[PDB]
Amino acid sequence: GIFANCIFCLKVKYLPQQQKKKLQTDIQENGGKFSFSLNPQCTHIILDNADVLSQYQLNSIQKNHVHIANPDFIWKSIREKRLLDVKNYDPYKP
């Protein structure tokens, strides 16, 4: 699937439960894996609008070349049936 070899850290605490679950299944069903923890193996971190990241987390992300994206990265990639440009979904670089 389109998320082959992607490992997503999910920081989406403030999404409705149904949406959290849909993000997970969208990821799993299309070749990806997800965690709730941020570690060197993450390729991406998905961050809903109400969540924030510490400086520690941001340093880790930079160090490990992790892509920061909003949930629309997942939703719209699934919709277009194609992995989109994650650079268009960065809550820190609009």
Numbering used by the authors: 4 to 97
Question: What is the paper's account of this structure, in its own sentences?
Answer:
pmcPARP4 is an ADP-ribosyltransferase (ART) that uses NAD+ as substrate to add ADP-ribose onto target proteins, a process called mono(ADP-ribosylation) or MARylation. PARP4 is also referred to as vault PARP since it can localize to the vault particle, a cytoplasmic ribonucleoprotein complex. PARP4 has a distinct domain composition relative to other PARP enzymes; however, the N-terminal region of PARP4 is homologous to a collection of domains found in PARP1, a regulator of multiple nuclear processes including the cellular response to DNA damage. Collectively, the study establishes the human PARP4 BRCT as a nucleic acid–binding module.
We identified PARP4 lysine residues K23, K24, K31, and K36 as potentially important due to their vicinity to lysine residues important for PARP1 BRCT binding to DNA. The structures superimposed with an RMSD of 4.3 Å (comparing 74 Cα atoms) and indicated that K23 and K31 in PARP4 approximate the position of DNA polymerase μ residues that are crucial for DNA binding. We mutated lysine residues to glutamines to remove the positive charge that might interact with the negative charge on RNA/DNA, while likely maintaining the local structure by keeping a polar residue in place. We determined X-ray structures of the four PARP4 BRCT domain mutants. As expected from thermal stability analysis, the overall BRCT fold was not affected by the different mutations, and superposition of the mutant structures with WT BRCT yielded RMSD values between 0.5 and 0.8 Å (comparing all 763–788 atoms). The K31Q mutant influenced the local surface charge at the K31 position, but also influenced the placement and charge location of the K24 sidechain. The K31Q mutant showed a stronger binding deficiency with an estimated KD value of 3 ± 1 μM. The K31Q mutant showed a greater deficiency with a KD estimated at 61 ± 12 μM, and the K23/24Q mutant showed no apparent interaction. The TM of WT BRCT was measured as 51.6 °C ± 0.2 deg, whereas TM values of 54.7 °C ± 0.4 deg, 54.3 °C ± 1 deg, 58 °C ± 1 deg, and 60.0 °C ± 0.7 deg were obtained for BRCT mutants F39A, F39Q, K31Q, and K23/24Q, respectively. The mutations resulted in perturbations to electropositive regions of the BRCT surface that are expected to engage nucleic acid.
